[PDB]
Amino acid sequence: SKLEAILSQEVEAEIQALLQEAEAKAEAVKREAEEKAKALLQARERALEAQYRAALRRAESA
């Protein structure tokens, strides 16, 4: 029926709006996890650079 299709379309549109909002939140969570991983990789890279600098300093000292 016309009201049948309208009610099914309204339920599907509410589910689609909810799914789009949840997918936007999940993509924001993925972007935040990527930002935290980039910060951790930057910390590990600075640690490796400081370790190589200290190793070169110890080698030149010896």
């Binding site: 009201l3 049948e4 009610l7 309204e10 339920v11």
Partner: protein, 50 residues
């Protein structure tokens, strides 16, 4: 105010006697065939002519 409250309370009591269709609604009633013209005019006066 008493007439408006009687009208609103009658509408509230009439809302209890309905039958839903899971975000849908359907109902049955009895009206005269001689009063079918004004009832059809009111049905066309509805938001959808359902």
């Amino acid at each position: 105010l008493w007439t408006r409250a009687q009208d609103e309370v009658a509408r509230l009591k009439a809302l209890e006697e309905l039958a839903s269709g899971r975000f849908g609604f359907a109902l049955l009633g009895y009206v005269p065939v001689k009063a079918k013209p004004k009832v059809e005019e009111a049905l066309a006066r509805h938001k959808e002519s359902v």
